[PDB]
Amino acid sequence: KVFGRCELAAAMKRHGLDNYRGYSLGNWVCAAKFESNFNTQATNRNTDGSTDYGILQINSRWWCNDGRTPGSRNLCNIPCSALLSSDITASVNCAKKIVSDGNGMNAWVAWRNRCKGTDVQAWIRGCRL
Ligand SMILES: [Cl-]
Ligand code: NA
Numbered sequence: 196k197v198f199g200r201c202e203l204a205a206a207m208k209r210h211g212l213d214n215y216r217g218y219s220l221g222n223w224v225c226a227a228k229f230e231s232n233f234n235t236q237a238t239n240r241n242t243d244g245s246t247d248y249g250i251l252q253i254n255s256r257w258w259c260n261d262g263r264t265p266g267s268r269n270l271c272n273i274p275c276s277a278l279l280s281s282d283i284t285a286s287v288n289c290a291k292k293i294v295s296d297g298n299g300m301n302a303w304v305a306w307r308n309r310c311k312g313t314d315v316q317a318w319i320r321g322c323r324l
Pocket of ligand 2: 258264
């Protein structure tokens with residue numbers, strides 16, 4: 196599923212991400228835009244052999260099992276394919292574990308390079324939330 200901007204904002208809000216660990220909703224919408232272009236089916240393979248999955252491009256080295264990332268942890272205890280669903284619940288629940296992990300949203304490279312320090316409230320402007 197390719198989400199619309201306000202559609203995703205509202206789904207993320209319903210799943211408890213607005214101000215989760217201090218990060219306003221706009222931060223999460225901005226991260227999803229630049230990680231996956233709002234496409235739940237996005238995958239990208241990394242040089243180390245791991246793969247990033249879904250709307251928030253969660254990585255198979257630490258967070259999910261894709262059966263082909265040797266010596267990976269599966270800290271969200273899910274198959275990575277579950278992160279590609281049109282229902283974002285699994286992605287959101289795993290993202291909450293990531294962002295609690297210590298370096299916050301800096302775990303998402305696109306957030307650090309393209310969202311951090313910008314006017315992220317713009318990503319939810321105009322939406323009925
Ligand atoms: Cl933080
Ligand atoms: Na893994």
